[PDB]
């Protein structure tokens, strides 16, 4: 019957979840001892300089913190669902906070990437690899936390597909959304730390809600970009919207990723929004001060327009409930 096979498929997803999880924990430990700990091993000191030894934290980031979480907590809780696989959604839900540690890891990854580029040919690694008997270099292992965090939604989506009629279909959908939310937040923060020239602290701007590149037109009142749109990268914050100009950077890898030169900033308390614009369902206007300053945003798709409109309105709605 159908109920039959779906429970079989729920079983498969639960298995891959537990297997890949154990492997993930093993692989991390494998690197934390076969490389990171070996950096403080006297018998190896003759293959490693003092500089590299100090950069250990840049190279590994908070891998250890991550390993303890999965080894001491998450793998243990996933196993407790071996019996009721539809309830795995609750594990993520009760640990959404602990997953925040992945932001620190991803934000530091490009720093590690740059370092690895300068120290990969170092004798130490070639030696640790040999000892460990790995056909792959430390670089393949250092990406695992990023690869793992970005597989959980896939797995939860698979579990949810086979649990439409189970007593946990709702917790699964919530968990899926929660992970997707953490992944979006982490990805947004990557762009944020690439902003340059900001006069002040970004932290007190409130939470970063959205970011993206758009073609922007202006239509201000009285004393450029009225016909030929300008290309800005926006950052929607609880307190303000930042306008940045993509600055092209050159280098080897992630160094190629652009930076964002801070240009202007609209304080949300004076921001207003026009959802519908004549002639383009993909445009929406973010105006300032009684509309004496109007910015027409060219959303690449309806979904993006909607997300931004929605986020702006939530913020504007809070402002209201707070201004009284």
């Amino acid at each position: 019957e159908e109920e039959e096979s779906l429970a079989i498929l729920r079983r498969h997803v639960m298995n891959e979840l537990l297997d890949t999880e154990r492997a993930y924990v093993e692989e991390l430990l494998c690197v934390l001892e076969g490389y990171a700990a070996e950096m403080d091993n006297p018998l190896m000191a003759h293959l490693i300089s003092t500089g590299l030894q100090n950069k250990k934290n840049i190279l590994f980031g908070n891998m250890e913190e991550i390993y303890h979480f999965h080894n001491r907590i998450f793998l243990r809780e996933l196993e407790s669902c071996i019996d009721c696989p539809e309830l795995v959604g609750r594990c993520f839900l009760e640990r959404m906070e602990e997953f925040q540690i992945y932001e620190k890891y991803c934000q530091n990854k490009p720093r590690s990437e740059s370092l690895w580029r300068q120290c990969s040919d170092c004798p130490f690694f070639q030696e640790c690899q040999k000892k460990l008997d790995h056909k792959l270099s430390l670089d393949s292992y250092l990406l695992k936390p990023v690869q793992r965090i970005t597989k959980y939604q896939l797995l939860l989506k698979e579990m949810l597909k086979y649990s439409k009629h189970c007593e946990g279909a709702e917790d699964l959908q919530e968990a899926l959304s929660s992970i997707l939310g953490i992944l979006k937040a982490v990805n947004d923060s990557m762009h944020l730390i690439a902003i340059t020239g900001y006069d002040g602290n970004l932290g007190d701007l409130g939470k970063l809600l959205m970011q993206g590149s758009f073609s922007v037109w202006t239509d201000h009142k009285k004393g450029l970009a009225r016909f030929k749109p300008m290309q800005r990268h926006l950052f929607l914050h609880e307190k303000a919207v930042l306008f940045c100009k993509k600055r092209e950077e050159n280098g080897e890898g992630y160094e190629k990723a652009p930076s964002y030169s801070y240009k202007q900033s609209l304080n949300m308390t004076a921001v207003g929004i026009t959802e519908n614009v004549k002639g383009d369902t993909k445009k929406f206007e973010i105006w300032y001060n009684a509309r004496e300053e109007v910015y027409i945003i060219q959303a690449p798709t309806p979904e993006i327009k909607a997300a931004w409109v929605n986020e702006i309105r939530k913020v504007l709605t809070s402002q209201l409930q707070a201004c009284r």
Binding site: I8, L9, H12, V13, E16, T20, A23, E27, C106, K109, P110, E113, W116, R117, K135, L136, D139, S140, L143, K144, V146, Q147, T150, K151, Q153, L154, L155, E158, L183, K184, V186, N187, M190, H191, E252, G253, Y254, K256, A257
Partner: protein, 178 residues
Amino acid sequence: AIRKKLVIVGDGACGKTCLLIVFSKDQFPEVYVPTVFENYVADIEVDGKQVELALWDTAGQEDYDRLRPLSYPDTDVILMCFSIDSPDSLENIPEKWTPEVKHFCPNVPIILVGNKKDLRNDEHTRRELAKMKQEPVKPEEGRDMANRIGAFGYMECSAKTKDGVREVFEMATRAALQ
């Protein structure tokens, strides 16, 4: 032995992970298709030269533009692909993937791939597509895109029939040795 890095890119649900599964294990999963494909090194030999091809999956990171590049460092060849039964995924090849792959991996050979060729003659998918005012992707369209982006070659395969699988990785390994 020679070591080369292959990073497979493209839209999610276009068959990426499955293709790697079929190639590395030489057998299409029947009941459950794995979601996870962790970095694996496959032994392949072309032009009488033994190569250790490191296969890096990217499934699950298509929606994150700042986490995606983290995989590109030191890539020898890129398997950029779309789904034969999705003219949409193909539109991203030039619109999304190519500009990116070329920016982080300059001068790195690209092998355009059309997955799920077997679904081209499948009436079921032909029907569903019609509703969306679409039809399967025609080989002619593939080669065009392949040259439009400047690929090292176009290729089609089927994870179900394993038809063309070996050929894809064999051709990509060659482009990597160049």
